[model samples]
Target: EFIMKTRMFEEEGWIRKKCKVCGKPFWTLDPDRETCGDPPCDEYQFIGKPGIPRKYTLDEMREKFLRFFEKHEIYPHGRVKRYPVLPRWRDDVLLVGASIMDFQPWVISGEADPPANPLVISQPSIRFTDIDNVGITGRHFTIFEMMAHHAFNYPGKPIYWMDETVELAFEFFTKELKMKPEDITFKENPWAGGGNAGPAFEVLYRGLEVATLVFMQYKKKYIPMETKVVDTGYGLERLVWMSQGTPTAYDAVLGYVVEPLKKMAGIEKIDEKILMENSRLAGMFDIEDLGDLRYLREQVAKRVGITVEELEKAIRPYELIYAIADHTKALTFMLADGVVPSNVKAGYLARLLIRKSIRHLRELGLEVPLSEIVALHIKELHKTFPEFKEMEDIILEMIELEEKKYAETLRRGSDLVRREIAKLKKKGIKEIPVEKLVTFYESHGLTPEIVKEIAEKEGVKVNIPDNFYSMVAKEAERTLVDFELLKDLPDTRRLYYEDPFMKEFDAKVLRVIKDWVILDATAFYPEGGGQPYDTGVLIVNGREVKVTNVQKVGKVIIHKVEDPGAFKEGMIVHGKIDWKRRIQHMRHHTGTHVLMGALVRVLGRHVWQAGSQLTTDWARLDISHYKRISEEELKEIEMLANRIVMEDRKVTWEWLPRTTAEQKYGFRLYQGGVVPGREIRVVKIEDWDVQACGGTHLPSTGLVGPIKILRTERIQDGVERIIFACGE
Candidate 1:
């Protein structure tokens, strides 16, 4: 019922063949080829291809990819700069995993325009899902550039779909790069996410897949989306390895960072054949089983003429070195963006990588701290990311302090884990349960691996669940507020955006459910961008029922009232919000952006909006920081903000195309974060401040009163919550 046959294959007269080993179908140019030319069907044949015609550097390969697509005669692509590793525009995801994340549901669904029609970007991406396999697997890394070409077919226009997408990929490998077509295989792969699902193909060269071409065509329930998209991702590191035919992907690109670390760790050489044989079976690492590892080790050991223990010992030093370099490179990008190690959110994720790097360094018997190793990458990557060099001191300080804090964590909690394990064993528990693994992680700061180390020494067998870290990562970002009850409600129209300062509204009662009044239309501003809910009263037949608070639940507005009365459905009513409160909130929101810009300019580019807490009397802007901002700096922040007010910059808000906004401002446009509306809205204060905000603002900056710098508090590590007196 389901077979993937591309028009490009049909036009090019290619043959569809099934793998003799696995019986998997793929399109190959060679009539004699029977296998799919991937793992199980084949091993990595690209490794150590001596004098491989071209042995290009990492940057050279990256440039070659961009130049090929950009200078294309038929389907030229626009070159777009890479996006930030931390996805500030989004709240759901912690880091950018692919080049497509830069657009996401905004451009993916055509809710907002794209930066360009067909664009190519070498996006610096990060993913922590496979942290355990980083070094052991010959091909895994936390930080890698996902070189991608995305074609967005707008709802009405049919720009390019599957035909052009596959055609471009086929030519790029065979014609542009001059790779033999006989070694290339396009294996059928299915991909789906967000609002679109599609038929995808993994473009393999000598058993190594260098790129994936996906054509997004369907919505939920296999429904076709209005927009057909061409989403392709080429692993830049892998392609460099393919071109250079290096021993490992790490050696191909990260040798400058990895080689020095190996020297520092006192590692000279291991059996290179074992490493190559291990690379062939690296896919087994994803299963990530402790029991299966022993079996796999036994199998690989036979080939290298070494015992299991000898093979393991010989390989660990190299793997640990690879892991440390990968972890350090990831940490460099995170801290370069001014992230501080903390207990929650991106802060916790940063600490996770930092501690992992520290452990890997210790395993390698390296005397240097994680911060020092990260510095090497700072210098190596400084040419591409100059911010890492500029903020070197601060980044190093954060890493060093985290090193101290992590050491302190074990010193304090080691006894606790030991005691807890003793009690569990006393209760006839011979092995630690998954429940206990979660308990130590959630209640105490101890991870499952940490507990396993202590418990096993205490004579307790511990089977660390394969999904232990994954379960923890899942538990980290969950929230309490369930919008489930509001799913069936229709979108509530807020008339405030039509006129922000409107104080009165005549609306009919739509429904009265759950002690809340639903109105047909009203000017009351619900809580948005962390501003406090609008408080007002609704007149039901001349009787005023106090509206205590308002909330936007699933796009529907529900007005909470103090008391219930004879409020019948479809009855005419008059409503009004408190003007004094409304005025203060508007000023506070406008004042926040000004101070944020001032903080970034004066303090450092590190000051990002970490939290948003808006009120009638005051407003708070939480920012990322390692140092307690000085009093003089606070004064400077307030003065610069006030200066914007004096200059009377026009406070403007408009619905702009998401792509257009990001084109000029890049990710800085998401300083305040996005609002869940039909379209992307942007608010600007002339040359002072701008963000993709959905909030009320005064017409002129002068209307915003002087920013009263009340105080700043270190809410947590990596965060500083500032209280600004917005009300005069």
Candidate 2:
């Protein structure tokens, strides 16, 4: 529906035709073409011949693409500094998958103004969905830069639309790159994601798509958007590949590191003819459905004029080498950005890549340290991104730490797998169940391959499914409430911010929906920022009612009550908080900051907060570390935190603009992840520690009393959960 109204089609006399093979409609200037310019329909034609006038390196192509937009004034003066790959602002996704993701939901929804009207950026993005296809497909990558030109068109003020977007792309290809007009084809396609849908065009040249022009105009929920956004993304690596006419995108992008990596992996030489033939056929392998992988391998073997066994033996080593090269580069970028390898969230994704890279290294019989390859990657990439140079030491340190952890995990996992296999053997079972395979991963972080190796050693057969990881992911899926019912409400005024010690207040009950009561203003603190909600009682008229829980949805605060009939709209009520419980929570929340500072001082600067939670009795703070916290170290941390309490240091917090706070304290201010809004609330403990937080805290460290380190555990490979308590 969105593809029919493009003005570029009519103005340029482009005809929309359906593909003879796939039946997908696409627009092209060539009226005789019967298929969409995509793989399977069309094989890659620019492998040996350059698609553009001259060869350009990855860095050269990035600058050239940015300069084209700047010269045209589409984006005057490109935005040089790229945003962080680990998106702290967004909670929905683990990483920035696209350049448009940086401004999504906020700038696209008309709720907040964009940083620039028509911005041009070369954003480094990471995606793990195609992890298995990284080296096999010849084009897939875990990390790549998405060079983009974005134009957000608000009502009554429009920068540009679909026509302008396509024109700029055409100019970049034909005028700037000196490609023939007949070679460029815009395939009509619709795009939708993150609650928005739009018509889009895939800019294809020589059977390779380098850019996409999207006209984002409608909400996915069947509503027209007041503001339309033009989102365009250009694959920088792919463009360089086309220009260089390399057999694989890896050969073009990782050309600098390939020779050294090959030497390190003991790969003396590879057959160019076989490698090129496999690269063309490698597109058939899909990470999601690998059942066809065997079939695809057979096809490649037949084309290469080699037996299936011979093909596997010859190509398997090179495939592992390519995967290691790609994964090591990805790990360098992720670690340079202060992403600590852990077992949950973005950290979990990083660990997955690191482990896979180690597995590849093992398969290649390469005994070199993982850090050696990562250091080479950093040295090469530091030319374009100097931040990697600054973080070289820490990045290498993390690689060493992660390598040690993986060794321990393998040792521990092997022992557990042996015990489990022994039990299965006792039960007279010859084959391990799929349910058991899923449990091994979900419960103990053991991959099926690891379990299979151990089981086979124990003389047991394992029937592993092709879709084992998918089934594990499906079983781990969680459902969350959207809370669409509370979207249109006004922001609730938080009185707790005024006085964290305030226990009582009188307020009007604005509305009652279900068992939740909305208040005009109250002192009840909602559950957020890892702190438990304030629980108290509401005095409606002459009766006392219990306030069971407090929750914040969007900007409005809802006070859940035990009885729906206890409160009514327009009625005045006396709200009283449980001061004892509130004070304990306040102490526990402040204690977290104190403990974090102690950990950094005791451990090292590499320590970062991984996660946290607060309750009335105690609080647990998860921190990034190389290994498990020793009992002696725990004692030292406990004594250090208590010493600060004895000093009676002032605990003060202030609201500062987000940019100002970030500049002053650096990213460390966001210990709890990225806080949303124009300004942030910063909690500082006299020069000891500072964090961007929203939870209630004490006025002085002395009020926190003595902090006790109850225990410690390794929540994952790289994260240590410090469970502690404050006060008597």
Give the alpha carbon lDDT tens digit for every residue of 478-519 in model 2.
343237776666678889999988899998888788889999
At residue 555, give the lDDT of candidate 2.
74
lDDT of each: 0.79, 0.80
As a whole number from 0 to 100, the lDDT of residue 61 in candidate 1 is: 78
Query: Which regions of candidate 2 deviate over 4 angstroms?
Result: 2-13, 74-80, 221-223, 284-290, 386-394, 411-492, 499-520, 523-591, 594-620, 630-692, 697-718, 723-728
Worst 10 residues of 1 by lDDT: 283-292
TM-scores for every predicted model: 0.88, 0.81
- Number of colliding residue pairs in each model: 0, 0
Tens digits of per-residue lDDT for model 1, 1-728 = 24677797898888987778877678988888888877767778877782235888878878988999999999899998887788776777878888888888777767777777899899988877767667777888888999988998886787787788888887888777788877788888778776668888888777787898888788885788777788899998888888777677888888988889877777869877888878777643334645465666777888778899888789888888898888888888887765677767777778777766676777677889788888889888898778888889778888888888778787778788899789988888888877778777666667666777798886898787754554565554657233466666667777888888889989888777768788778888877787887888888877888888887776778888876566877899888889988899889988888888888888777678878888878888898887688899888888898888888888877886666777776677776666554456788878777788767888888888778999988887778888988755
Q: Model 2: how far is 479 from its true place, Å? A: 5.8
Error of model 2, residue 462, in angstroms = 6.8
